[PDB]
């Protein structure tokens, strides 16, 4: 199961992801330091029976930025594909929504891309 | 069907002229964009997009969407709003949302 393990960006975020047999993603965001105070729960889903012709595996996950110590009143979802092999990747787009007043709700959601690799930069 | 004044659902007003060959020009601030000047006749909407640079808020919004004609004409869009930022903040420089434009307020 090539999804399971530690994934990084070139901003160097770190995510440890476990892919369960029938489609569950679980795990954590971990800080560069790796302590509990900057650790956040991740949960999501993936296609557990993708096409086996070299196509990617569709997936998504969410982190809400609250733990037992900090709360950034926000949550990010990542949507993308896992691609295996020697240069494995998870190629994603993300949406980061902050809790806002109704007057500011229109500007509550940031968007971007994230490329994850198994190799720590 | 595109040329005219359009209102989003939050106050905003978009005055646009659609040129024969695909140009969108007007004001929102100056607006400019492009549209499909020969859309399909298969019930499809008319693809379009435009940009407004907010000059100064040091930012610019692009709307991407389609015009749908008829008695309840609409321009249905999603938008990206990018701010000028430092490199450190570039990762968080773009907001996303949607706008529905109609011919009445």
């Amino acid at each position: 199961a090539g999804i399971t393990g530690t994934w990084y960006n070139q901003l160097g975020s770190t995510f440890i992801v476990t892919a369960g047999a029938d489609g569950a993603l679980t795990g954590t965001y971990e800080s560069a330091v790796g302590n509990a105070e900057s650790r956040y729960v991740l949960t999501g889903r993936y296609d557990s029976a993708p096409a086996t012709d070299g196509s990617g595996t569709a997936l998504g996950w969410t982190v809400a930025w609250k733990n037992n110590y900090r709360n950034a009143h926000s949550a990010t979802t990542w949507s993308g594909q896992y691609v295996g092999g020697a240069e494995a990747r998870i190629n994603t787009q993300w949406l980061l929504t902050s809790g806002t007043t109704e007057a500011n709700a229109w500007k509550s959601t940031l968007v971007g891309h994230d490329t994850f690799t198994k190799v720590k930069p | 069907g595109i040329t005219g004044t359009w209102y989003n659902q939050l106050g905003s007003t978009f005055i646009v002229t659609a040129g024969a060959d695909g140009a969108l020009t007007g004001t929102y601030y100056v607006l400019t964009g492009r549209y499909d000047s020969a859309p399909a006749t298969d019930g499809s909407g008319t693809a379009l997009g435009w940009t407004v640079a907010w000059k100064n808020a040091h930012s610019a919004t692009t709307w991407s969407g389609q015009y749908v004609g008829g008695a309840e004409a609409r321009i249905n869009t999603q938008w990206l709003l990018t701010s000028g930022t430092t490199e450190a903040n570039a990762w968080k420089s773009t907001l996303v949302g949607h706008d529905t434009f109609t011919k009445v307020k």
Partner: peptide, 7 residues
């Protein structure tokens, strides 16, 4: 997302 910068 620059998570370290956001938090």
């Amino acid at each position: 997302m620059d998570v370290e910068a956001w938090l």
